[PDB]
């Protein structure tokens, strides 16, 4: 029973997306892929993945396509191994699905090798220490929660706070000039968003159809059944692993949304005979996510910079899924709806974000000191805000109001117009250098810009843009005064 290739079985049960298969010669190994060879008048092929063994002959499986027109006793043939996906530079500039089949209608892809989507994660000895700052061109991220090359980044947020926009901005700022390759994995998200990304990448020449592309797309979206959404992330991750190990390149891995991987497995968990855990997730929530996350790491051979978007259902960060993902990250960016409602974008709550490289040994001492001072001032400003509501701004002391006035400028100065949100904002984006951000905030903390109007810091880039906006504000105010004077 070593080689199960071509082994035959019969469908015994069909309930939703879960199918039971009976093999007379013994059920193949778990995670094995099966094809429904029987002609059932279907418009699409049917493939199954074994997840459990009910006995020595019966095996429970999840289908990757809809189980419509599926009858009992239908013939099934093993593929001799797990689900395999193409790898190599020949996949660049292409769009794939969970099964590794191109869906761009751009002709056959020349694949020299295929790899299984299920692989063992790197061991402890295969861990590389890479502490280098990653410049995303964003004031808030570069200052409070700087990102690390070869590390893991999470964008925790609700619905409509700006998780997808930030990813687009990161791609525009980090991927266009990236030396290595990039892999984007759409998981249980809107299909139109993937289309917009594909068009933008082609325009930015990341995907050069006539020339050489430097990115791959793997899409398993909402319309797809839960089986596909539970394996698309593995497929893309397998492609990145190949680029990391075989090609020895530094690769980017964007994932949106990683929560859908957990959600899909919960949907099928009920039909697999597993008792639900708290809230209603599957009991294997922590282990399944852990196996996937550990594969997303930088080893001694290559480096993977991973950016994952996490959906916090109903803005409840105490939910098991968002919480379980916090320990598997090197930098967490927590978005808050209240911040967005105040007109601040990106709606980052710096008091809840964290970074591993926020240590003087890794980053410059000035950078570390400035960030801590900003955090302390914001924390103090929030306590004062409680006083300002009860007593009023008048009652505050001279020192307190100076903190209030400076802190408010910090809050508005953290906002930044992105180059990808021009339609949303109606203004051109800005790319702020790391040094400019540090210097601008350092001067603000010590009061070098106490006389500048507060609104001059709203939706601008570096300090230079602040001064220009202040000058423009002064000019228009003078014109209004002149108009009033004539009246």
């Amino acid at each position: 029973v070593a080689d199960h290739k071509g082994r035959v079985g019969h469908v015994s049960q069909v309930i939703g997306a879960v199918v039971d298969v009976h093999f007379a010669d013994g059920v193949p190994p778990v995670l094995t892929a099966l094809d429904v060879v029987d002609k059932l008048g279907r418009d699409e092929p049917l493939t199954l993945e074994i997840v459990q063994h009910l006995d020595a002959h019966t095996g429970r499986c999840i289908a990757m396509q809809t189980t419509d027109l599926l009858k009992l006793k239908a013939k099934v043939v093993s593929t001799g191994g797990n689900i395999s996906v193409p790898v190599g530079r020949e996949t660049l500039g292409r769009i794939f699905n969970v099964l590794g089949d191109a869906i761009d209608q751009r002709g056959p892809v020349g694949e020299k090798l295929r790899m299984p989507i299920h692989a063992v994660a790197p061991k402890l000895a295969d861990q590389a220490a890479e502490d280098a700052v990653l410049t995303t061109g964003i004031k808030v991220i570069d200052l409070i929660l700087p990102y690390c090359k070869g590390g893991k980044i999470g964008l925790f947020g609700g619905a409509g706070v700006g998780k997808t926009v930030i990813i687009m901005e990161l791609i525009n700022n980090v991927a266009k000039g990236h030396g290595g390759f990039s892999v984007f994995a759409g998981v249980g998200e809107r299909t139109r968003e993937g289309t917009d990304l594909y068009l933008e990448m082609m325009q930015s020449k990341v995907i050069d159809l006539k020339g050489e592309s430097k990115c791959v797309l793997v899409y398993g979206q909402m319309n797809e059944p839960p089986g596909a959404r539970a394996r698309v992330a593995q497929s893309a991750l397998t492609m990145a692993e190949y680029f990391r190990d075989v090609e020895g390149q530094d690769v980017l891995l964007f994932i949106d949304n990683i929560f859908r991987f957990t959600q899909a497995n919960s949907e099928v968990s009920a039909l697999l005979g597993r008792i639900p855990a708290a809230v209603g997730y599957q009991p294997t929530l922590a282990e399944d996510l852990g196996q996937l996350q550990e594969r997303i790491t930088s080893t001694t051979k290559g480096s993977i910079t991973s950016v994952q978007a996490v959906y916090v259902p109903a803005d409840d960060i105490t939910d098991p899924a968002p919480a379980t993902t916090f320990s598997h990250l090197d930098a967490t960016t927590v978005l808050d709806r209240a911040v967005a409602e105040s007109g601040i974008y990106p709606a980052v709550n710096p008091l809840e974000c964290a970074s591993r490289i926020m240590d003087p040994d890794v980053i410059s001492v000035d950078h570390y000191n400035v960030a801590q001072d900003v955090v302390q001032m914001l924390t103090k400003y929030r306590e004062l805000q409680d006083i300002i509501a009860v007593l009023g701004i008048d009652e505050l002391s001279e020192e307190d109001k100076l903190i209030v006035d400076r802190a408010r400028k910090l809050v508005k100065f953290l906002s930044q117009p992105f180059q990808v949100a021009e339609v949303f904002t109606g203004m051109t984006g800005h790319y702020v250098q790391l040094d400019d951000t540090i210097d601008s905030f350092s001067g603000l903390l010590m009061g070098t810009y106490d006389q500048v109007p507060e609104m001059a810091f709203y939706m601008v880039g570096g300090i230079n843009s602040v001064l220009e906006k202040a000058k423009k504000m002064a000019e228009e105010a003078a014109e209004l005064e002149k108009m009033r004077r004539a009246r």
Binding site: I15, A17, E44, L69, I103, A159, G160, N223, G280, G343
Partner: protein
């Protein structure tokens, strides 16, 4: 030469609106998610849908019609095909069930199709005018978009969608049928009377010629309520795949989930959160992914979705509400407090959003909306934290957002432009609606013989398309537009506001109060 059916077994058990079947030994067997006919009589059949295929051979069936006629021991025939329903222009103006059966009033499309591929879509760039200034400016909707309508009971969720369907009647009559917007209104778990009132309301405005209704009333079994959205969108996919645009309204998905929960629990499916089945997200997900904007290569057709969702005590933390919000491209939140506060439609702009953005707005509306957005943002913050210009115009914009019927694009855009450029600064907030009514349905310049404009007048309804082409801030239309507004403002202030501010008599005061309230419900 016989009409030989495919008998697959007998009916074993019946539990309300669902049933179970035992297959007769040595029979072909039935396929998953297929339709079957239960022979309630040698000539009469009841429709059922396959839901489960168990190891024992037993089959779970969701009944759809003639439930009362079903008894244990009856024969079952298998059609061997999925659900197909009639589709075409011949169904417009009619009331139908999810099975396609027409409901008397006093081409076949598959219901389980897949959504368009990633490369089969195009960016949303064509607007879909709801007719409400608040939505059309701050919450743009584009063809091929999914825009949730979430709110509490008795907040206008149904009225706004119906008005959106009606607002297309006037447009469709003028422009070519190519760009006409067809409507599929789906009523789920609603009262039969409400459907009839909606049918009469659409007929009065003549919207039935471009609209069809798919009704699954409360008295009907859960199976029909479960399939109505899929059948309704299928009728709308006929036009999408043929270079035409459609608008599907679901009223409402909240009652669809209840029906799906009822079916799953009766058929021995493990419950999940709030007893809903585990795969409840996937239900709506595949429903709303079928609404898209097809690429030029496939025709350019589209389907626009306006699913409706009900909350309890303005709690958007519920299960199904959260799932739908995470699917749609935008949400219109109707707030109970605003509704009782006199603001109608009670659109909470802060909690409402459209992820398509200005791309779903006409070139004429882009400039007005962009500047309007900044003023309101400041207006919200100023009052939250002094007659500044943003605060003067912000209140008037809010007053202009009160409506009862959809507004023609020309009338709405012009009024917004006037309030934007300070033409209403001298007008009291209470009198803004009266000012708008005179501007639209009257012409002060002609009344007082001071109108020197050549073509630009509010009674020339054909100017809407010229405005939609060149923009208001263009030399062709800008010069005359300002002149008309200047004359209208001067005449209105001189002849009307002066008298209005001089009223002290109780009779006159009461008469004025009735006038202004009526003006709210007129324009």
């Amino acid at each position: 030469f016989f009409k030989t059916t495919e008998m697959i077994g007998y009916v074993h058990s019946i539990d309300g609106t669902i049933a179970t079947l035992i297959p007769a030994p040595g029979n072909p067997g039935v396929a998953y998610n297929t339709i079957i006919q239960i022979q309630v009589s040698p000539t009469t059949f009841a429709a059922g849908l396959v839901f489960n295929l168990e190891k024992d051979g037993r089959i779970g069936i969701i009944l759809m019609d003639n439930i009362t006629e079903v008894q244990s021991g009856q024969k079952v025939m298998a059609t061997g095909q999925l659900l197909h329903i009639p589709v075409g222009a011949g169904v417009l103006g009619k009331v139908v069930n999810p099975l396609g059966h027409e409901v008397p009033v006093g081409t076949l499309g598959k219901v389980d199709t897949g959504a368009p591929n990633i490369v089969s879509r195009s960016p949303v760039n064509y607007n879909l005018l709801t007719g409400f200034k608040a939505v059309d400016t701050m919450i743009p909707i584009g063809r091929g978009q999914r825009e949730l309508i979430v709110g509490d009971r008795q907040t206008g969720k149904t009225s706004i969608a119906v008005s959106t369907i009606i607002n297309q009647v006037r447009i469709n009559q003028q422009i070519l049928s190519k760009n006409a917007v067809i409507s599929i209104y789906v009523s789920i778990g609603q009262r039969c009377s409400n459907v009839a009132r909606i049918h009469r309301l659409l007929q009065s405005y003549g919207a039935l010629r471009y609209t069809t209704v798919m009704a699954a009333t409360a008295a009907e079994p859960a199976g029909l309520q479960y399939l109505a959205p899929y059948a309704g969108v299928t009728m709308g996919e006929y036009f999408m795949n043929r270079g035409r645009h459609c608008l599907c309204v679901y009223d409402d998905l909240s009652k669809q989930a209840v029906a799906y929960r009822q079916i799953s629990l009766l058929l021995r499916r493990p419950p999940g959160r709030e007893a809903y089945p585990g795969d409840v997200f996937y239900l709506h997900s595949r429903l709303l992914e079928r609404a898209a904007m097809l690429s030029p290569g496939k025709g350019g057709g589209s389907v626009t979705a306006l699913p409706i969702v009900e909350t309890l005590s303005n709690d958007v933390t519920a299960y199904i509400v959260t799932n739908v919000i995470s699917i749609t491209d935008g949400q219109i939140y109707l707030d109970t407090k605003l509704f009782t506060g006199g603001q109608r439609p009670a659109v909470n702009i802060g909690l409402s959003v459209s992820r398509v953005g200005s791309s779903a707005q006409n070139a004429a509306m882009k400039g007005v909306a962009g500047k309007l957005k900044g003023i309101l943002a400041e207006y919200r913050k100023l009052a939250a934290d002094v007659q500044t210009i943003p605060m003067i115009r912000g209140a008037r914009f809010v007053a202009l957002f009160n409506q009862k019927q959809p507004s023609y694009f020309m009338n709405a855009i012009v009024s917004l432009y006037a309030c934007l450029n300070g033409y209403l600064d001298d007008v009291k907030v209470q009198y803004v609606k009266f000012y708008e009514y005179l501007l639209v349905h009257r012409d002060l310049g002609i009344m007082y013989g001071t109108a020197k404009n050549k073509f630009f007048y509010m009674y020339v309804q054909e100017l809407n398309y010229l405005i939609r082409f060149f923009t208001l801030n263009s030399p062709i239309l800008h010069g005359e537009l300002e002149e008309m507004l200047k004359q209208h403002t001067h005449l209105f202030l001189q002849h009307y506001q002066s008298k209005m501010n001089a009223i002290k008599s109780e009779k006159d005061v009461k008469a004025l109060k009735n006038l202004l309230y009526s003006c709210k419900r007129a324009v």
